[PDB]
Amino acid sequence: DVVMTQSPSSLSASVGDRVTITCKASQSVSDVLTWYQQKPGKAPKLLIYYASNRYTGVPSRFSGSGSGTDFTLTISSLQPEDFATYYCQQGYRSPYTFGGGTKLEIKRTVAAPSVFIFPPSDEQLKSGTASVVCLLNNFYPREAKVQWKVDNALQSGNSQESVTEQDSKDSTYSLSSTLTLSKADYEKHKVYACEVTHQGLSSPVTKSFNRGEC
C-alpha cells in the first residue's frame, strides 16, 4: 500500500506565524492528494483537492503544493480558529491511505484559570454517592496540577480529571477534576478543598467548602 508519512506529528505556533506541514508518499501518487482539517469530535473538512487547488470557501491563507511524493500544506498566517488535526490523504491508488496527522496547537499568552468547586448535590446524596467537582476555567498553557484535600489530608487514587480541547476562540483549555466518595465516606469529613497550581498563578489557589456548613 501507499504509505503517507506526515510531519511533524504535533506543532505549537503563535497567531500570525507561517505553518508548513509535510506529507511524504512512499511511492508516486501524482498530484492526487487531499488535505483535511478536522476539529475534535467533528468530521474532517476538505481544505485542498489535487494537491494545490483550494476548495471553495477555504480561506486564502491555506495553500498546497507538490507532486509525485513530496507534498506541503502551508498556512500563510496562523489563526486561532486553525486549531485542528490536519491529515493528508492520497487518492491515486486504492486502498486510500492517510498520513499520521499533524495536531496543530495555538501558542498564546499565559492565562490563569478561574477555579470553582461544587459540593455534591442532594439528589446524588439521596442515591447514596457523593461527587465533588473542581472546575478550572480558561487557562493556558495546558499544564496544570489539581490536588484534593479532605480535612486537609492529601488525597490520592480517588479522583479523575478531564481536559477539553483547545478553544477555537481564546485558545485556552478547561479542566474538570472530580472526587468520588461514598455517602458514608463523605459524611465522615467536613472540609473538602481542591488546590490549583498553574503557571499563570503567582501562588496556588484553593477553593473549599465545609460539609454541613452552608
Binding site: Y49, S121, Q124, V133
Partner: protein
C-alpha cells in the same frame, strides 16, 4: 441539500457482526461518477479507510480487512450498507461515510462531503442510562453545570437551553470510572446578575439507552441543610 447520515448500534459484543447504514440525500448513486465510502477513526487515532462502492456496484476494500468487510448499496432507497464480522475491541471507533462525485475528472474534489459519524463500542457490558445531577452556582461571573454519571456506552450529548446557550459552555470528555460506567460534566460561565432572572437547563441525551433528561440548574439555598 447534500447530506450523509450514519446509523447502527452503539454497542456490539465481541466476535459478533456490526452492520452500519449510510443514508443520503441531494445526490443519487445511480448517477455516473458517484460513490460512497467508509472511514473509521478510533478515539484519538488517525483516520483509516475501510471500503468504497461506486455507481456501477464496483467494490473496493481495505486489503487487511477485506475478509471481514462487505459493502453493498440500494440506489432506490438512497442507502449504503457496510457489514463487519468478528468485531474486536480494537474495532471501537467512530465510523464515517463520505461521498465522491464526478470520478476521475477535474470536478472530482475527492471526499468533500462527510457524515457526522456514529460511535460503535465493542464490549460485552450492558447499556445503562445516566443519572443527571445539578452543579449549583452558589457580583462577577458564576459557574454552574450538570453531572452526567453512570452510563454506558459512549456517547452523550449535552446542550444548554436547547442550543440557545453556547458561549462559555465546556462539556468535558467522559472518563471511564472504576465501575466500568462513564461519567462527564458540562459547565457554563454566566454572569451572576442573570442567576435571578435567567433559567439554565442542561439538555442531556444518551441515545444508546434512549434516555433524554432536561435538568434545570437552580441556585442552592442554605435552608434544609441536614
Amino acid at each position: 441539500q447534500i447530506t450523509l447520515k450514519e446509523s447502527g448500534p452503539a454497542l456490539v459484543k465481541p466476535t459478533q457482526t456490526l452492520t452500519l447504514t449510510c443514508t443520503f440525500s441531494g445526490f443519487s448513486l445511480s448517477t455516473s461518477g458517484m460513490g460512497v465510502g467508509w472511514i473509521r477513526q478510533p478515539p484519538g487515532k488517525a483516520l483509516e479507510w475501510l471500503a468504497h462502492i461506486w455507481w456501477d456496484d464496483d467494490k473496493y476494500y481495505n486489503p487487511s480487512l477485506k475478509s471481514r468487510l462487505t459493502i453493498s448499496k440500494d440506489t432506490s432507497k438512497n442507502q449504503v450498507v457496510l457489514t463487519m464480522t468478528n468485531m474486536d475491541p480494537v474495532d471501537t471507533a467512530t465510523y464515517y461515510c463520505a461521498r465522491r462525485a464526478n470520478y476521475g475528472t477535474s470536478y472530482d474534489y475527492g471526499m468533500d462531503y462527510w457524515g457526522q459519524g456514529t460511535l460503535v463500542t465493542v464490549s460485552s457490558a450492558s447499556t445503562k442510562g445516566p443519572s443527571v445531577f445539578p452543579l449549583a452556582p452558589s457580583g462577577g461571573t458564576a459557574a454552574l453545570g450538570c453531572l452526567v454519571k453512570d452510563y454506558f456506552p459512549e456517547p452523550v450529548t449535552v446542550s444548554w437551553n436547547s442550543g440557545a446557550l453556547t458561549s462559555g459552555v465546556h462539556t468535558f470528555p467522559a472518563v471511564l470510572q472504576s465501575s466500568g460506567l462513564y461519567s462527564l460534566s458540562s459547565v457554563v460561565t454566566v454572569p451572576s446578575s442573570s442567576l435571578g432572572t435567567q433559567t439554565y437547563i442542561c439538555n442531556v441525551n444518551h441515545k444508546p439507552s434512549n434516555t433524554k433528561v432536561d435538568k434545570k440548574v437552580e441556585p442552592k439555598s442554605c435552608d434544609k441543610t441536614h
